[PDB]
Point group: C2
Amino acid sequence: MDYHEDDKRFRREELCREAEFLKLKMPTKKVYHISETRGLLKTINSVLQKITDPIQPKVAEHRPQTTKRLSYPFSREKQHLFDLTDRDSFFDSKTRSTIVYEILKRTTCGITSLLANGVYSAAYPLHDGDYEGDNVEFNDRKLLYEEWASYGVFYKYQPIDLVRKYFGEKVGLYFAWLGAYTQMLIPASIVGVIVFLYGCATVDENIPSMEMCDQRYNITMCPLCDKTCSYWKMSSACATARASHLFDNPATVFFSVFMALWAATFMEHWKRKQMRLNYRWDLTGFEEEEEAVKDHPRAEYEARVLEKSPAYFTNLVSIIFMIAVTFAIVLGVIIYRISTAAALAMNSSPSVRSNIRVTVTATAVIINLVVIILLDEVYGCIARWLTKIEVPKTEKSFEERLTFKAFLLKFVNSYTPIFYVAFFKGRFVGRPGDYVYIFRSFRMEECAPGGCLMELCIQLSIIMLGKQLIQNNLFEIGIPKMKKFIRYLKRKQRYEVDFNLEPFAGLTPEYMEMIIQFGFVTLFVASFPLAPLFALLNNIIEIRLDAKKFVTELRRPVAIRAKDIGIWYNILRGVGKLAVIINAFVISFTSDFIPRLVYLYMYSQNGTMHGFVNHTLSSFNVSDFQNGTAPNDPLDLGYEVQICRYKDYREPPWSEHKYDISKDFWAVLAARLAFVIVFQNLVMFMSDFVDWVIPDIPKDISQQIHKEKVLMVELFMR
Amino acid sequence: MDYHEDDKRFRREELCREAEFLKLKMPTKKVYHISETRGLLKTINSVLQKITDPIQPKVAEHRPQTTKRLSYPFSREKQHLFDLTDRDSFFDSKTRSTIVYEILKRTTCGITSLLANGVYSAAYPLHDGDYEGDNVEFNDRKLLYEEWASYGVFYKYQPIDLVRKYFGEKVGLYFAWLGAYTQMLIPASIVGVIVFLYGCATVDENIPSMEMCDQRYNITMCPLCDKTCSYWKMSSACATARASHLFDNPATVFFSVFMALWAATFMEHWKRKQMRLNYRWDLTGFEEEEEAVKDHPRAEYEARVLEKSPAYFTNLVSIIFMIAVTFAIVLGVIIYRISTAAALAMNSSPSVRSNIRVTVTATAVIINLVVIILLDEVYGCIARWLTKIEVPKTEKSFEERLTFKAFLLKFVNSYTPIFYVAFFKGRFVGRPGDYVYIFRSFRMEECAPGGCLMELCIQLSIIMLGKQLIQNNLFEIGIPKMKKFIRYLKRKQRYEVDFNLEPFAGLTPEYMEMIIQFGFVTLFVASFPLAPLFALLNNIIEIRLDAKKFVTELRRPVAIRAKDIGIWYNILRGVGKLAVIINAFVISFTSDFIPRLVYLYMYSQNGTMHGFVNHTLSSFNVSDFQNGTAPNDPLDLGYEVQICRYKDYREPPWSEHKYDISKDFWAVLAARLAFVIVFQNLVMFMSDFVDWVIPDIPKDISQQIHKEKVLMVELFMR
Ligand SMILES: [Ca+2]
Ligand SMILES: [Ca+2]
Ligand SMILES: [Ca+2]
Ligand SMILES: [Ca+2]
């Protein structure tokens, strides 16, 4: 039989003598506050623990612990501090666990101090029962795993007060944030789907693609290759253009405006919901003023400076971390270069002779994804090490600086390839007269046949379906199970079957995955619609996956209380700040929309647009290729290749200045920057406007706190 | 002899019978709370009033009135609510006045209700003594007028706790805001002066102006006139260019970056100082929750909807006010058009024969200033009427909506001419082949000989020295004195010499003048340096002028307490938001700096720049002027005018396309928009960064409130 405990420990069953001395000096240091026993098994021991009501209301009143009462204004029971209980056990296991952890943190000998020194190896509360077993009696964990964590309740709201009461305000806050996230992605998903469907409706009726592969024109192009390539029909590469019309139309600009508006209204709506939850749960946010615990390395550094008697070394390791950030930027770009150069001279030595020319970039970004996964792991480790060497004075400051540094590193090495593809792909390439060669060795970069917006779109597609939806979830399932198999290959009481679980690392990784998701959603939505749909599917898996990870594998967290979400809301605000200018730069420099508008309203000469590809595509006297970097096999699929047509808005070779920058390039560049100006400033004003209209504090919650405080003093006077 | 009263009234000494009935029903409604008498003079009466300590601590404890004590942590005495007094009169006159006004507002029969209905005509507390008279005994008003309001103490700090204690937290907050304003304008003034001095050092050594009036080149220009003008040497108009080099150099961009940084650091520094003042004074900001008073028209509208049983009519009058705002925009532009067309055909009928060509624009903007002064008055009146018809439910909501509407109207009609001059002056003008004519009547607009940046700079100069420094201060002195002379032409006790003063209208006009000042300072600083200097002079007059206006003419205010400055900080944040994009547009489209950089780094052909004016200035076959709109007297001051040189970056007439837009215009336009992108985004990031670095809450003030609350409960337990 097993009674009702609150917290546990782990001694190691048998210098080490002084370790045992502290190992029995700390429990007798707390034994005049609490009560504890010791458990028995031949290879694994433990230290049980029991709270006493002599002490639990005493240290409960030590803080403003605000607990429920017996009076009710309008079916909404109030919450006083402590006056009368008449049950003596109406404190839940979560409250008992956080209060005994409060006592354990109060005694120092600081439980985490010696727990990090390694004289013990565990400190965890107890889960309540088994998840859907034999003759179980409907405890909180069983009902939670039934109605919340099952994959069959993916289409229903989550019991948020239940996950609060069983897990902690922080875990309840994370899951309610995910709920509001998915509920806000639903309409953005529907609008992305209808934008893509409008593109699918107008793709067979638009002008510039049906003429980009109108046949019987026999027009050629110029090889974007290195040395060993051939001229190729522009009409032979219109699968890419006819697919890119789905990703670029006058509706994607509408969806980008709507999506920046959606990001602002989501941040406002979750500020409203977070204030609502902070009212409904514990309200007050008066925490301790850096007075609870200091770090042991902090304290011995203060002892060192006392005995020897730093303050700018935080800034020195900050510029160290910025150099590491620029290091990671350049590493991400060169890793993408290596990955897109994973098939260099693929025709000579392997002689594949299949030549789909769609698969090489797929394998390229797959290798890129694998290397950035490994780099995500090593950057998380080095961010932990850098935040440890930063020596922050508190624990929350350590967590905040670690979160900021790890997010900056993960943002850098998860967005450098997409930045390089969407913006810097075919900019710095020269003309067919001369290109740019690194080390005077080979041509540096080349964009895609049919627009490397398609490279951007397939990269985003399989980085939302090949890393987020599949790889991240499969690793999140497998790494716990692989760790449990490596512990299995290398009836029982609750405090031991709880020990056979893996410890709770933090909410930082789940927050980080979801914020990188949010960056992928709101940062590159302009060229790529239905990215809300991929995020909706990933999150409709992710909420129940995290629920299973909490109630089925993870041992019980400490249930720490928190009002804010942390720095993650400021990080959301930063990503929503960057979203408008990156959508602007995508629409201008990538979407190939401003050149279409410029042609339509400057070089029309007919009314609507026609011959836009003949307007864009320049010409080139093919006898100007330098030093034998010509096409190594001029095949003459046509009668003879006389002029190759590359699109750069340059002057034709039958002019006085040949291969010079024409007026049209400066015209489209000026109008592109004009659209960045107009779009960025207009949607920034619209974002601040929809922030200003929607009130931060809920009107209903202000009414509830008004009537609640009114009745509080009206019942306090009598 | 005169005893110590707190508040006054005014009955009218002799329907009107019911008026007298309410006139003696209201004082007997309050007489079981307070004590009052009645005064005597043959033509003017009054109603005196006296508080009693039976009642004043009673309603003082009714609110969290926080008063000083007898204990002190480290020469900083604490502030409890009410426990022990042992003096019975340590409440100041300000506290007694605001508490008797609290009682008067509590009784409704709402003192302002019947005061607005007009059964009384005054409600004001009593000033303390005479300002530097005969045998006065150094009261608060006398010491205040001596050491604060004198013009001889303009170079010393202001007694801020003294003006707090004598006037109110709101008036103390306004004057401390002005103090921090001038203290922040001092370094911006010094940097503006050194930027102007650098311009004065490099003006005789720069390239483009010394060649703009290098002689012995005999170059001509093309008349920017209507019909009756002549060609004119470009070297004859270099006073304008040699003066515009002072206002445009590579240092004005530095000063614009520094000034946006200054605006952000000023807002942050005043947030710090406002939190410091809110700690040092009354701290808590828990006001009443819309429960103190409702408006009488609000209440009778609720009676109307009760008897008949609107909510969107606030939005209907809001779009009405937006139509009025666009009305005021177009009115300001057409008023500037009328003012700059105040001398139309000035040579034919008057035959001035002086022709300085610098004075017509001066008289133009003078007429513009007079008409916008009259429009400022009528817009203030119509904003009061629109906010009254908006029917806000509270009084603070009425003041806030009135402030926002009046500021939007004053911003519109005080910045539309400067916007039209700095941006839209010479844009929509065509070429000498064809211009644009309204109604096919006459040419619409023309820019200045030598750049209408000089028009902008003289307009800003005499709108900071001819409206702010001179006209506003002289009207602020005279209108009180003119009202006192119109009351004089159409010994005594304190409650009557106080009645011979003019009532306190509000702090909204002084706030409004200073915020329009701040807009002039931070919105158009890029082209115009040393505008901080003009603001420093205006404010170094303005603080002592407002101090004299308070302690010498204005009757004593009610001394209302407030934590925030109001919506004026949000308005400062909005102006600082607009400042970066308007500085960007000034530097690009007005400063003539991006064309110089574009010439230097694209069309150099020599190294440094030379012949920039010959690069900018196009040509025009003078036989192409249409329909006899040629120069009406081609004087041939040279040998013969063959080609007139206008600057539009257009193609010369000896090309295939003549008078077509050249490549250079699109090049300089693209680079202008690139600089707007770079400057706006970079300095917006720098503004948010210098917001993030400086903490909002002062670290010292957090220490003080920490030790204060610690000792509060440590003395409360015992
Ligand atoms: Ca996932
Ligand atoms: Ca995850
Ligand atoms: Ca003034
Ligand atoms: Ca003034």
